[PDB]
Amino acid sequence: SKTGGKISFYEDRNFQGRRYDCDCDCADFRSYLSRCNSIRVEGGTWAVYERPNFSGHMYILPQGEYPEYQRWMGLNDRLGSCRAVHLSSGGQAKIQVFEKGDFNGQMYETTEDCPSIMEQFHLREIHSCKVVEGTWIFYELPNYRGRQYLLDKKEYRKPVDWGAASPAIQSFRRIVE
User: Fold this and answer.
1) Beta bridge partners of 46
2) What's the rounded Cα separation, in Å, for the pair 162 and 169?
3) Helix (H) or strand (E) holding 118
4) Are the C-beta atoms of 168 and 125 separated by less than 8 Å?
5) Measured distance CA(52)–CA(177) in Å, rounded
């Protein structure tokens, strides 16, 4: 019947205080919760944003229990919207990256995660890349740290096409169940 992913947010730590359960994406949770300092993910993987309309800091949460915001690496207890991340399987995920924009310059192809792009490819920035899988994550600082950007399965010709204000990207990882 109504089978699906589910996430629960609690206003206080240790799952105490008012609680709210969500089974689908929510663009504005401010009317049901004024703050969230702990979260429980019962099933599925979700993306949470600090401000409504999927804006502000974004964090990916896999299934699991987080008795406190620091357990989710939250910067604070502010969350205005959340969306369910769909994972795509199929076979072998492969990615191609180009040194210049519009798929120009030297190209490198790899099927593994990259902790440091400069150490692996000797590149300080990335301006274009072709990924065909489904959902991929890019991070602004090495070791998967800093602001993260979620890529889908479309054709990105400019860095701004990934929602980034600068072509700076230092690491990336594939999402898997």
Assistant:
1) 61, 84
2) 11
3) helix 117-121
4) yes
5) 27
CA atoms within 13 A on the CB side of 89: 2
Longest dimension (CA), the chain: 55
Domains along the chain with CATH numbers = 1-87 (2.60.20.10), 88-177 (2.60.20.10)
Contact 46, 63 (CB under 8 A): no
C-alpha to C-alpha distances, 78 to 42, 43, 62, 85, 106, nearest whole angstrom: 21, 22, 19, 20, 42
Quote helix, strand, coil % in the chain, to nearest 5: 5, 40, 50
How far is residue 117's CA from residue 114's CA, in Å, rounded to a whole number? 6
Experimental method: NMR
Handedness of CA 133, 55, 50, 20 (dihedral sign): negative
CB 72 within 8 A of CB 37: no
Is the CB of residue 62 less than 8 Å from the CB of residue 38? no
Q: Is the dihedral of CA 64, 70, 72, 74 positive or negative?
A: positive
Broken C–N links (> 2.5 Å) in the chain, after residues: none
Q: How many residues does the chain have?
A: 177
